């Protein structure tokens, strides 16, 4: 019975209209007692550009999170230069009962993100 | 004439993003420290002139931090992103680079322009 | 259903619920648009059953999103009275996701699977 | 002294990070009596992906306009396909005193637009 993470992502390569497979993503959360980023998990996107199992319901607490997408390495492996060596998306979770989809739609020279559910 | 420019557009309201704080940094490639080059605030056209001089514009990895949560809160609204940082590599130093931020409360995009 | 969509209201970070979407196919001889389906997005901003797998033939399609009516029911104006995305389908074995991410003064779309 | 069109555009090719040069653009306005699109101007973008003189101050009245971008043609002269054979942005003008910038930021498999000033 497959466990469903409340935080999901999707990487789409908009230049060829295909998923962003095999991109390294690192999730962090700011520690409020110190003021430092704590690493939570590191994953590699699957062939559908997604990264299931980012975090459990119990660990998904209110806080500030950072997702780092290794875009420079992603494009390097495709044999291409990228304008952005990495992409960090920093976001505030206050409502913990909701699903948060935090995707990266990217080309070599542009990207976008949105909050969804 | 800054070789690096920006423009902030509030896509929720279709107006320039005025008075947003933007800090430009340059990476120390040998350590991995970020150095602050310029701190500015966008004007009523959403622009930030004089981000850097021609003479200080060398190849390297630069970051612009845009103070998005502070911008939205001043307008009476929350933002999903406490700040946005765009990190980009400069190799060819004779080109102009336009690095804009197009944002709502819950989205943002950027593109490399000239 | 090999064609799917998703409407995101990126001003509020919520699904774009109750938006009318009309799907057409171009008559490749006359240049007429033939209506295929008229739907309304659900609470999750999706429109299931846009086309059936049998009826999904190659050619040029248009999805029309009634954006001006969507914002109007929300008590707001939209720069765009409607949005039409026109695309060419050459391979009918694939899934095509044709979404609309919109605010009152912007929008974007992406070919997805 | 230069006459500036109240309606401007900019086409940006976001897969290469260059201006979308030599893109055909056709501006229409909805006819008040027939319910038909009337062609106003046809142009080709310049080397900076822009099209000065889309319309005169005097022709720019309250209305519903459509900007058509020949994206299929544009990509084809670069030797590639596009998912969209053309792109039309239909927009309402009520306030005739403001400047309107209606850009197109395009890859072969994505595009975006915004209302600007």
Swiss-Prot record, chains A, D:
Named in its record, the pathway it takes part in is: Purine metabolism; urate degradation; (S)-allantoin from urate: step 2/3
**Keywords carried by this UniProt record:** Hydrolase, Peroxisome, Purine metabolism
Q: Which GO terms describe its biological process?
A: purine nucleobase metabolic process; urate catabolic process
Report which reactions are catalysed by this protein. 5-hydroxyisourate + H2O = 5-hydroxy-2-oxo-4-ureido-2,5-dihydro-1H-imidazole-5-carboxylate + H(+)
- EC number(s): the record gives 3.5.2.17
Output one GO MF annotation: hydroxyisourate hydrolase activity
List localization entries.
Peroxisome
Which top EC class is given? hydrolase
Q: List the disulfide bonds.
A: none
Keyword Hydrolase belongs to the record: yes
Query: Where is it found, in Gene Ontology cellular component terms?
Result: peroxisome
**What residues bind substrate, as annotated?**
10, 50, 114
Q: What is its main location?
A: other
- Return the similarity comment: Belongs to the transthyretin family. 5-hydroxyisourate hydrolase subfamily.
Question: Any other noteworthy remark?
Answer: HIU hydrolysis also occurs spontaneously, but more slowly.
Q: What does this protein do?
A: Catalyzes the hydrolysis of 5-hydroxyisourate (HIU) to 2-oxo-4-hydroxy-4-carboxy-5-ureidoimidazoline (OHCU).
Known partners and oligomeric status: Homotetramer.
Give the protein's recorded name: 5-hydroxyisourate hydrolase
The organism is Danio rerio
Stretch of the intact protein here: 22 to 138 of 138
């Amino acid at each position: 019975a497959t466990l469903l993470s409340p935080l999901s992502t999707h990487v789409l390569n908009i230049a060829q209209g295909v998923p962003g497979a095999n991109m390294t993503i690192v999730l962090h959360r700011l520690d409020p007692v110190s003021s430092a980023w704590n690493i939570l998990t590191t994953g590699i996107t699957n062939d559908d550009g997604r990264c299931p199992g980012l975090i459990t319901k119990e660990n998904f607490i209110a806080g500030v999170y950072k997702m780092r997408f290794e875009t420079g390495k992603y494009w390097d492996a495709l044999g291409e230069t990228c304008f952005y060596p990495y992409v960090e998306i920093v976001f505030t979770i206050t409502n913990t009962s909701q699903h948060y989809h935090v995707p990266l739609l990217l080309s070599r020279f542009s990207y976008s993100t949105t909050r969804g559910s």
